């Protein structure tokens, strides 16, 4: 797998992991437990300009997903971030 | 506007490649008097574990690798909706 492809993915995954940590820490600051899926879901709801194919695909998938599909996609994305 | 033209084009090509998978898949089934679902075809496609050629494919394969049986069926369904968009 080309080096450029991998690098874009690792950067993408690192960005999402930082999003989750920041969200969980802020929650902790307010005495609350915040779920990873909720944080990632809020990130996708922001519609940030896609910078790579990963973000472009996620935003397109999000745009055709119903409410239940959105929750499941966010949950699946958490497992991707968390490993995998 | 904000999305760089190349990121869009790459997605358009990616989407076209999936649409290619589906059409051919449906064509093969039709010739055998069978109706094949797009989600089944895209699922078989992801099951091949083809080497990713772009960010779109890389994300899809990584998602597929952590998905349980239900999540795989649902992601394939969502991908069909993405392919048949606009």
Swiss-Prot record, chain B:
This is Uncharacterized protein YflH. It comes from Bacillus subtilis (strain 168). The gene is yflH.
């Amino acid at each position: 797998i080309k080096e450029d492809i991998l690098k874009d993915f690792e950067e993408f995954k690192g960005y999402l992991k930082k999003q989750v940590n920041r969200g969980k820490k802020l929650g902790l600051d307010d005495g609350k437990l915040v779920k990873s899926a909720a944080i990632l879901g809020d990130y996708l709801a922001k519609h940030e300009e896609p910078q790579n194919g990963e973000e472009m695909l996620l935003q397109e998938l999000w745009s055709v997903a119903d409410e239940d599909e959105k929750e499941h996609l966010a949950q699946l994305l958490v497992k991707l971030v968390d490993k995998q």
